[PDB]
Structures are given as C-alpha cells and as structure tokens.
Design brief:
The structure is cut from a larger assembly and holds chains A, B, C and D. Chain A has helices at residues 4-31, 39-42. By secondary structure, chain A is mostly helical. Chain C is α+β, with helices and mostly antiparallel strands. Chain C has helices at 64-77, 118-127, 143-155, and strands at residues 19-32, 36-48, 53-61, 79-81, 94-98, 101-107, 132-137. In chain C, a hairpin with a 3-residue loop joins β1 (19-32) and β2 (36-48). The longest helix of chain C has 14 residues, at 64-77. Chain D is mainly alpha-helical. In chain D, 55% of the residues lie in helices and 0% in strands. The longest helix of chain D is centred in the middle third of the chain and has 17 residues, at 21-37. Chain D starts with a helix and ends with a helix. Chain B binds chain C through residues 9-14, 16-20, 22-23, 26, 29-31, 34, and chain C through 85-86, 88-89, 91-92, 107, 109-111, 160, 164, 168-176. Chain A: This is Mitochondrial ribosomal protein S17. Chain A: Belongs to the universal ribosomal protein uS17 family.
C-alpha cells in the first residue's frame, strides 16, 4: 500500500529530478556540451 | 697591472630558483657576474 | 690521571687552524660520608676551526688546570660540522630552546658585524660566524646551556646543496 | 608567497610551514616558470594551485631529461 510518505518522497524525488534537469539545461544553454571542470575555463 | 675588484654588498642566502636546462645554458652564477659588471659600472662612474 | 688522544686526530691539529675558548669554570659542592666537603671544578671548553666545524667539551676534575685540560681535550675529541653561507652567516632564521632558554638567532648580510652578547662573541668567532644578530631570553644565568643550546641551534638549519641533483630545479640568483 | 610576490598583489597569508630550503627554492622557481607560461593572462584565468600537481610535472621534466641524456652523440665523446 502507498503509505503517504512513499507518495510524497516520490514527488520530492521527481521534483528534484525536474529541478536538476532544469538547471542542467540552464548550464547547457549557458555553456554547451562540456565537462563541469570550471566555468572559468569556458569563459574563453 | 691594474683592475677594480669589488665584492658585492654581500647578501643573505637566498630564495633561489631556475629551471633545469638553464644549468647547461648559463655559464657563471650571478654573484660572480654581478661582481664583474658592478665593478665595471662603478669604475666608470667613479672615474668620471 | 691521563687524558686521551687518538691517532687520526693527529692529522687535524697539523691540518686546520684551531682556537680554544673556556666557557666558564664552576665550583660545585658535595658533603660526603666520611671526610667532609668535596668540590669539583667543572669546566666547559669550546673549540672550532673558523671554517664551520665546531666542538664542545665538558670536563670535571678536582683542580682547575686539570679540569680545563680535560674539557680542552674532550672538545677536541668531539667535533661537529656546521654549514655557513661562505663562512660568515647561517642559512635560515634559527630559534631553539635548551633547558628552558629562548635563543633567537637571525642571519645578517656580511659586514653587519657581530651584534652579539659576551661569550657568544668568542663562540661565533670560534666557529666562524662573522655576521649574525642574536638575543638570548629566559634565565641566562648559565654559560653551559647557552653553549650546548648554540651547538644544537647551529645543527638545526637546512642546506640547499642537497637538492639540485634530485629536484630537477636549479638553485641560483641571490640578488636582493 | 611566491606568486603573491611575482604577480605583485597583496595576499591574505594564512600560515607558514617549515621546510627544507631546497624545497622552498623549488616552489618559487617553478612558480616563476608558471608565470612565464601564464604571462599576461587575466588573473582569474590563471590555473590555480589546486589544479596543478607540481611534483608530477617535475617528475616529467626529470624523466624526459634522463631520457634525452641517456640518448645523448656528444655524451660518448665526453
């Protein structure tokens, strides 16, 4: 049975995943395909 | 015979570094070279 | 009594130059079972060669000439070698503490002269330090501990010529 | 302190390690070499000191130097 902790923690996991996808795509549009070594390297 | 001989204003042992092939490049260490060059410069100036 | 002298030390007295300094001579006291108050003269002799090999010798005996002779020969038995910069100053700053005495020792550029207390002037002229500013702190009331402390404090420092073979990194340009 | 002095900026100094003089000589020599490679670059674009292992680079210099001298030739005439 779905005890309510399971459902909320699932929602928090997918919310964190949607967040990480969003800021990862923010990094993708800001930088392009690149290793996260540094942005100071990619500032050139 | 004649020459000026001046020992440099003689300093501390130093922070002291240079890359390795400069050993094969450079000939004499800078205390002797500064002795010769500072001797020449001070000789010309004190002659004037 | 007889003091000892070896064979291979007899290339050194014919070898280097040498100077001798008595540090202090001291009269200690002991009341003993049976006859009374027995004293010994404790004498402390330093000996260097003014090129960076230093020695200390502590001697104990019943009379002053024999005590100073024993410490005189004990120092000349016991020699340690100390690196200098071209025979006038030490490589680093030097701080040390024997028994509880705070010596502080600095290098000075050559021709500073010795700015230096009493017995340590003859000590630095003995081993070959021409240009060093020192101060000793704590209870300075003993000559013996500043002598031993100075020997260890000379032995503390570090040498640059043990690198250039194995560091890949050449060590020159002393221009300030 | 070395790149603090050779880049001529004030630096918030933290502490002072005791060391052999040959080592501190090697640090300041290699940082002068780094400033020769990083000459005129903008200061935040300097390869920072965590990003650069000094000992592996000096080990590479040692290895290629012993390689070039072993495969020296004039070494045979010497």
């Amino acid at each position: 049975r779905s005890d309510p902790w399971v459902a909320e923690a699932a929602r928090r996991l997918d919310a964190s995943a949607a967040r990480l996808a969003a800021l990862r795509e923010l990094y993708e549009k800001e930088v392009g395909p690149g290793v996260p070594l540094s942005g100071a390297v990619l500032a050139v | 015979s004649g020459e000026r001989l001046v020992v440099r204003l003689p300093t501390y042992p130093a922070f002291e570094g240079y890359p390795l092939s400069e050993l094969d490049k450079a000939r004499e260490g800078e205390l002797g070279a500064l002795n010769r060059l500072v001797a020449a410069r001070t000789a010309a100036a004190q002659w004037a | 009594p007889l003091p000892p002298l070896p064979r291979e030390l007899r290339e050194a007295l014919y070898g280097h130059r040498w100077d001798r300094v008595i540090v202090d001579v001291r009269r200690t006291h002991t009341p003993v079972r049976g006859r009374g108050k027995r004293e010994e003269y404790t004498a402390m002799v330093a000996t260097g060669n003014m090129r960076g090999v230093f020695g200390l010798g502590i001697g104990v005996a019943e009379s002053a000439q024999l005590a100073t002779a024993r410490a005189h020969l004990d120092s000349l038995s016991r020699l340690a070698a100390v690196p200098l910069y071209r025979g006038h100053t030490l490589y680093t700053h030097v701080d040390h503490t024997f028994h509880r005495l705070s010596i502080r020792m600095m290098p000075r550029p050559a021709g500073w002269g010795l700015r230096c207390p009493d017995l340590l002037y003859e000590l630095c002229g003995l081993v070959g330090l021409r240009d060093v500013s020192i101060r000793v702190r704590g209870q300075r009331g003993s000559r013996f501990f500043v002598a031993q402390c100075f020997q260890e404090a000379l032995q503390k420092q570090t040498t640059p010529h043990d690198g250039v073979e194995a560091t890949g990194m050449y060590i020159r340009e002393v221009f300030r | 302190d070395a790149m603090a002095q050779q880049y001529d900026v004030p630096a918030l100094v933290a502490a002072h390690v005791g060391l052999p003089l040959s080592q501190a000589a090697a640090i300041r020599g290699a940082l002068r070499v780094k400033a020769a490679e990083e000459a005129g670059k903008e200061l935040r674009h300097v390869t920072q000191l965590k990003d650069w292992n000094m000992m592996e680079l000096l080990r590479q210099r040692m290895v290629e130097r012993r390689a070039a001298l072993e495969a020296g030739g004039e070494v045979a005439a010497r």
